[PDB]
């Protein structure tokens, strides 16, 4: 009756995570607490990125996360930048920055 | 009508939890869905390689933990590990 997602207090689909694990040819026996752990880690990362992007968007007079502020949050946070270093976000552009040498005065 | 499996829902739930009033566009939703799948692939491959190193034929929560330790930069790793351990503990008790 009680879903494993709610049973663990997580929002992500523990069941779907377990299914994907034992179907992606990763191993031969997916533990009972491995799907829960992976779902929790993914949920934490998603919450972090979503909160950062939402706050960056709200700073810009917006009430809807757009790829721009996703990129901004990903690149401003050192941890997320390291995790997503080689990644590129479509319609994300770059961060505002002008080298001191180029600037006048 | 290719019934796939996007994370557009659970992602939206987490968004409402962190920011109840903040919405998300379709492009941002797809970007988040791609990020989720990318992190899933990374962690799963790392846990598989770990299980193969110890000659284990199963990916247990400990393998996922050790894989998360190898990917997230410290504080992020320390928080992800804490969240995963808390989730597994609460699951084992219910």
């Amino acid at each position: 009756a009680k879903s494993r997602s709610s049973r663990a207090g997580l929002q992500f689909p523990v069941g779907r995570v377990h299914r994907l694990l034992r179907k992606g040819n990763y191993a031969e026996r997916v533990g009972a607490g491995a799907p829960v752990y992976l779902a929790a880690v993914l949920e934490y990362l998603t919450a972090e990125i979503l909160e950062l992007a939402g706050n960056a968007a709200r700073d810009n007079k917006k009430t809807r996360i757009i790829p721009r502020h996703l990129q901004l949050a990903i690149r401003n946070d050192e941890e997320l930048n390291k995790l997503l270093g080689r990644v590129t976000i479509a319609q994300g552009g770059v961060l505002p920055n002008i080298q001191a040498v180029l600037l006048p005065k | 009508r290719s019934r796939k499996e996007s994370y557009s829902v659970y992602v939206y739930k987490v968004l409402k939890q962190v920011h109840p009033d903040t919405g998300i566009s379709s492009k941002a939703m797809g970007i988040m869905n791609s990020f989720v799948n990318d992190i899933f692939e990374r962690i799963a491959g790392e846990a598989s390689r770990l299980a193969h190193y110890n000659k284990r034929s199963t990916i247990t929560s400990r393998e996922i933990q050790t894989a998360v330790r190898l990917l997230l930069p410290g504080e992020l790793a320390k928080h992800a590990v804490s969240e995963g351990t808390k989730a597994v503990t609460k699951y084992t008790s219910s």
Binding site: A47, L52, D77 | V18, E75, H79
Partner: peptide, 9 residues
Amino acid sequence: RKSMRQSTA
């Protein structure tokens, strides 16, 4: 939740 690492909190 809205409670993460001090840098994000």
